[PDB]
């Protein structure tokens, strides 16, 4: 049955965040997209917590917590979905949430409605959103003294995402919707994804 095949492939590709260890780090395969995530930049972030004074809310703040590079990738995927989002966006939003607020490799479709939504079209729309987003990110300039764009922000009721281009990769942060971390020393989660990962 055509619907059956279609939904079989969409379910498989959207509900399984596939991670495979490699020599340099990790291969991630999700939604038919492939990423090489390496462990570079990892140690540097621990060590920091000039740049240190630029992002005091991350480095000079006992409420900031460094995450894994895979977490950073997942934040980038969710952001990619949400950025155009701002049809059934219910399913999209669920997916983005799963990606960003959890570390599980499988997406439990709770409702049957959600399951019904999983289709070639949904796969297609998600892939296109994420690719568009990645292209946008690649247009960011490194942090600079002229007025050239270096950050994008994706704000939602539940959380605020901020992604910044620096000489060491994309700095990926999630703060509370209000931006309590920016006083004040509100909580914030963050990491670094090397440039190579998005190419």
Residue numbers in the entry: 13 to 61, 71 to 107, 114 to 209, 212 to 228
Sentences from the study reporting this entry:
VP24, one of only eight proteins encoded by ebolaviruses, functions in virus replication and assembly, and is thought to contribute to immune suppression by binding to a certain class of molecules called karyopherins to prevent them from transporting a transcription factor termed STAT1. In addition to its role in interferon antagonism, ebolavirus VP24 has also been proposed to associate with membranes, and is important for assembly and function of the viral ribonucleoprotein complex (RNP), where VP24 binds to the viral nucleoprotein NP. VP24 adopts a compact, single domain, α/β structure of novel fold (DaliLite v.3). The overall shape of VP24 resembles a triangular pyramid of dimensions 73 Å×30 Å×30 Å.
In order to provide 3D templates for understanding VP24 and its many roles in immune evasion, replication and assembly, we crystallized VP24 from Sudan virus (two versions crystallized: SUDV1–233 and SUDV11–233) and Reston virus (one version crystallized: RESTV11–237). We determined the structure of SUDV11–233 at 2.1 Å resolution by multiwavelength anomalous diffraction (MAD) using selenomethionine-incorporated protein expressed recombinantly in E. coli. Crystal structures presented here include VP24 from an ebolavirus that is pathogenic to humans (Sudan virus; SUDV) and VP24 from an ebolavirus that thus far, appears nonpathogenic to humans (Reston virus; RESTV), although it is lethal to nonhuman primates. The overall folds of SUDV and RESTV VP24 are similar, as expected (r.m.s.d. of 0.81 Å; also see Figure S2b for structural alignment). The entrance to the hydrophobic cavity (11 Å wide) appears to be gated by two residues (Y172 and M71) that point away from each other in RESTV VP24 but toward each other in SUDV VP24, appearing to block the hydrophobic cavity. Crystal packing can sometimes illustrate biologically relevant assemblies, but no tetrameric or other higher oligomeric interactions are observed in crystals of SUDV or RESTV VP24. One pairwise VP24-VP24 interaction is conserved in the crystal packing between the SUDV (P3121) and RESTV VP24 (P1211) structures, although it is currently unclear if it is biologically relevant. This interaction involves α1, β1–3 and the N-terminal region of α8, and buries residue L147 that was previously implicated for virulence, although 142–146 remain solvent exposed. Another crystal lattice interaction observed in both RESTV and SUDV structures involves packing of the hydrophobic N-terminal regions of VP24 into the Face 3 pocket of a neighboring molecule.
